[PDB]
Design a protein around this ligand. Sequence first.
Ligand SMILES: [Ca+2]
Length: 269
Amino acid sequence: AQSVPWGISRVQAPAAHNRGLTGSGVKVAVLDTGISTHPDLNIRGGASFVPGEPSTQDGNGHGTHVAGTIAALNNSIGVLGVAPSAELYAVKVLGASGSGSVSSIAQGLEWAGNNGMHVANLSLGSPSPSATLEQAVNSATSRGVLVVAASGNSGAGSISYPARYANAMAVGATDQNNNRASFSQYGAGLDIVAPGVNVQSTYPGSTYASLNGTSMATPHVAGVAALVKQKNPSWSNVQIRNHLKNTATGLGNTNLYGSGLVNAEAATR
Ligand SMILES: [Ca+2]
């Protein structure tokens, strides 16, 4: 039996699937702890930038969970991703502790840009600004990648890096009431929000787990960006970003919510 997690229904991904849009032909790089093999995931390739780790296997769980919110297969098991036919690439930039360096994150972004990824999901943050990060987001954006990044989980009124930079689409987290989740960082630079509380998805060891975080909200927006790219193959990263903001359901003040809740039905109309 396949279940549809509440967040997938909340962003109205099933409505876009009924229009025949599933993210087919869209390449999505998940820059995280890796992605492990799972019966409800199909991983196309990837690269590791973690010192002394040649593989893209997930030693943490986080990367595999994020991957399942974007693209868990539409079948008779597990869950269902926002864009279940997207081509997933595992770009391992964080180690087993969930930590990484600005150098591995920046190498991952350069790989995404050099390998023609359409969307790069960064469910990660650095507490401090980094010129290296800004430059790598800008480089990947110039090559055509839409970078989507988590605002962070401190609950503060400023968002983390690289989400704060102009060329990153910053994603905050909502709960089941469509309120901002208490941990979700907000403030200047916030673009959009998506479900980030009790998000069930794929996990290592062929299982499933429920997690909370702006890292869970970010893949919902990366997934809806892949549905828009399938509908509109000639659109640029900037066009997709603006269309996602323009069609989001407003939830209140933009300092707290950006443009509001991502809406895959309205974005694929
Ligand atoms: Ca499934």
